[PDB]
């Protein structure tokens with residue numbers, strides 16, 4: 001299917017057993033979710049964006065369902081204002097930009 | 100054209116006579132450029148990002164060529180690591196996300 005950009009491209013995801021809404025974001029290298037618990041080891045990281053930087057925890061090999069399809073990759077967790085699905089997971093679903 | 104997302108979706112733009120690089124960003128409502136000179140008056144705007152909020156200058160009705168296509172719209176100028184083409188201008192080109 002085709003997703004329009006007249007509105008924010010927000011989709012439902014399932015991660016860590018929880019259902020959430022998240023923004024499909026071609027301008028994000030990585031996926032960043034509002035603070036939550038995830039299984040396994042993690043390492044601290046600083047990620048930068050428009051307002052400056054925030055400290056997050058990086059969990060690797062985390063499974064996520066997006067649009068029902070199951071993908072796996074790195075997920076950063078911390079005080080982000082909204083959940084963001086980055087290119088690292090978008091590629092796994094075969095997403096492209098077209099015009 | 101079709102753009103995959105294994106690397107950052109960077110395109111060439113032309114604004115105020117100058118060629119620049121910019122990131123195609125579906126997760127951005129608006130277009131934000133690094134400090135530069137633009138004609139006309141500006142008005143104040145606060146935009147929010149991952150790191151919080153920042154003051155930018157809002158210039159309305161600015162012509163930009165993106166991939167040689169002319170768009171005319173609002174451009175925000177302020178502190179940013181990268182020029183960002185947001186949904187306001189991506190919609191003028193007819194960009195969609197597809198999988």
Ligand SMILES: CC(C)c1nc(CN(C)C(=O)N[C@H](C(=O)N[C@@H](Cc2ccccc2)C[C@H](O)[C@H](Cc2ccccc2)NC(=O)OCc2cncs2)C(C)C)cs1
Pocket residue numbers: 025026027028029030031032047048049050080081082084107122124125126127128129130131146147148149150179180181183185
């Ligand atoms: C130039 C160099 C430093 C670059 N690094 C990168 C890799 N990096 C750091 C990222 O992708 N970082 C992501 C990001 O913020 N990307 C950004 C572009 C950018 C990149 C680097 C530095 C500054 C801005 C752009 C992202 O789409 C974010 C997503 C978002 C949306 C709402 C709330 C929080 C976040 N969009 C926004 O910040 O919107 C700003 C707004 C515009 N108009 C109204 S609000 C994080 C979410 C992970 C790309 S270019």
